[PDB]
């Protein structure tokens, strides 16, 4: 059974493929303070990686 990853986190992971850990991408889903949220690729990759380690 796959450990749960939210749809927004999935989008951000997709957006960060073939890119550097320091690179920043736009969110596909999130707006805060009148602007599309920016995400660092290192953070989303890491969060996904700790979920693949907890998956069967």
């Amino acid at each position: 059974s796959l450990a749960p990853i939210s749809a927004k986190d999935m989008l951000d992971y997709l957006a960060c493929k073939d890119k550097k850990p320091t690179d920043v991408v736009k969110s596909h889903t999130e707006v805060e303070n009148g602007k599309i949220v920016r995400v660092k690729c290192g953070d989303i990759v890491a969060l996904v990686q700790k979920a693949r380690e907890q998956s069967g």
């Binding site: 059974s1 796959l2 990853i5 749809a7 927004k8 989008l11 992971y13 997709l14 069967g56």
Partner: protein
């Protein structure tokens, strides 16, 4: 060997594909097909429901008994003669069918685009010889009433009150072993890497099993409403839903309309999405220019087809066509199913993506197809995200016990269902405040509107994921959920202030 049947089918049945005869292959298939442990019969919740009058046609192997009248015995020709007046159009439709004109198929020349049928007849005959239902020199004379409805190639009389059956998948499969085996192979090919869905599902092979194993279907008292679900879920039991009785036309089953009665509606609007897309509108405009009688493999050459159809896309796999429609399935309609979104980046899903791309390149370039399928995947996740944010709100209210009527008027669902939050049962059963409006709204947001969004994306109808279906209706749900949440927050705030004024 049956060249179009997957290795995993022979492995599951413990058959050597190089050695097994048609008879052995058939018998192993039917043994699984008729086994209650593999899905046949009334299922795990059989003590909870009873058949209605039409159920004898929906699941014949479990429920069918011949009529008590007429009290007559009849030979081959007596079927045709009496039914020519009693059910006149059935005899008329049968007479114009391939089944009743097998000599026409034998006389097909090599320059006829329908020549492939001669080979299919010869294969059918070889199957019947292997099974001992036909002599080695004996040709199959016809497929008539007595053959499907009593016994294949019956030479003597039948008792209308005892011997009459409704032809099921195994009946057709006696002759059409290839197609039956291809269909049954869905059991073995539709295996999810993490058990996202039960093994072999979703598929036509287990549509009836899936139906009767749905708690609310078995639990609800409105049997006639429940049997409406059944009517869309009969492929497992009978082979006449795409190519209908009694013409049994392959051409008809290739037309998009053949899939429409079942593959439509509030929670999977495939017919609506497809027909509105350019693909479907072109299919509507060009249908008279195409030769629907040619096999799917010849559709784009001999057929003249220039727009894709349900059958051509979904029965295709790696350049070949089979009755197995499961091998390219990635999203499986409902994007919210646990593990489905998380699985979209796997090598398993990626290989099925390559297979889809191949299908598209019949016409489009690879680069074009990959560009759009990327859109489909991401658009789907964007919809899922919208739903998930909304669900977090209503689910929190459930955990808090603050849903309308949750502690005062939330009666338990009918046995054997267990109470819960946003369960499928709440679509087909409701009493008091089970469910609450907020709870139903967010359920339908995923079940109906997110599912239709994906369908719109998958089938290339731009309005079906933006304004009209998908995004627009999901936006409304999100807005109304937020609005009610806020209204209820300040109402409980006001009530708390009244509680303080009662402290006195």
């Amino acid at each position: 060997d049956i060249s179009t049947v997957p290795d995993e089918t022979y492995d599951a049945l413990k058959l050597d594909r190089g050695k097994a005869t048609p008879k052995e292959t058939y018998e192993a298939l039917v043994k699984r097909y008729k086994d209650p442990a593999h899905g046949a019969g009334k299922g795990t919740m059989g003590d909870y429901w009873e058949p209605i009058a039409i159920s004898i046609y929906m699941d014949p192997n479990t429920f069918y008994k011949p009529p008590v009248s007429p009290k007559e015995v009849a030979e081959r020709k007596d079927c045709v003669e009496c039914h020519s007046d009693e059910t006149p159009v059935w005899v008329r439709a049968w007479k114009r069918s391939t089944h009743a004109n097998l000599d026409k198929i034998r006389n097909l020349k090599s320059d006829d685009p329908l020549y492939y049928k001669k080979g299919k007849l010869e294969e059918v005959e070889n199957n019947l010889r292997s099974m001992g239902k036909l002599g080695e020199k004996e040709t199959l004379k016809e497929v008539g009433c007595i053959d499907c409805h009593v016994d294949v190639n019956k030479k003597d009389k039948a008792d209308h009150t005892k011997d009459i059956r409704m032809p099921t998948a195994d009946t057709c499969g006696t002759c059409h072993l290839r197609e039956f085996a291809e269909r049954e192979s869905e059991r073995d090919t539709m295996v999810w890497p993490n058990g996202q869905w039960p093994a072999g599902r979703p598929s036509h092979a287990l549509d009836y099993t899936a139906n009767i194993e749905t708690t609310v279907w078995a639990a609800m008292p409105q049997r006639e409403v429940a049997e409406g679900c059944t009517m869309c879920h009969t492929n497992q039991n009978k082979c006449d839903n795409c190519h209908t009785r009694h013409e049994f036309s392959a051409a008809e089953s290739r037309k998009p309309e053949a899939c429409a009665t079942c593959h439509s509606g509030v929670d999977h609007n495939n017919w609506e999405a497809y027909t509105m897309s350019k693909h479907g509108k072109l299919a509507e405009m060009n249908r008279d220019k195409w030769n629907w009688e040619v096999r799917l493999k010849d559709a784009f050459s001999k057929g003249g087809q220039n727009a894709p159809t349900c059958a051509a896309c979904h029965m295709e796999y790696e350049g070949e066509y089979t009755h197995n429609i499961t091998r390219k399935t990635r999203w499986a309609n409902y994007p919210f199913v646990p593990g489905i979104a998380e699985n979209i980046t796997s090598d398993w899903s990626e290989a099925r993506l390559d297979s889809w791309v191949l299908t598209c390149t019949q016409c489009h370039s690879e680069r074009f197809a990959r560009s759009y399928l990327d859109l489909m995947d991401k658009g789907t996740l964007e919809g899922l995200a919208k739903y998930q944010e909304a669900n977090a709100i209503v689910h929190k209210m459930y955990e808090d016990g603050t849903l309308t009527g949750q502690k005062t008027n939330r009666p338990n669902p009918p046995e054997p269902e267990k109470p819960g939050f946003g369960i499928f049962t709440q679509l087909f059963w409701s009493k008091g405040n089970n469910p609450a409006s907020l709870e139903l709204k967010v359920l339908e947001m995923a079940e109906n509107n997110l599912a239709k969004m994906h369908v719109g994306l998958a089938h290339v109808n731009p309005g079906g994921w933006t304004y009209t279906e998908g995004w627009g209706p999901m936006n409304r749900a999100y807005v109304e959920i937020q609005d009610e949440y806020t209204k209820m927050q300040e109402l409980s705030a006001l009530q708390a202030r009244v509680n303080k004024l009662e402290g006195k």
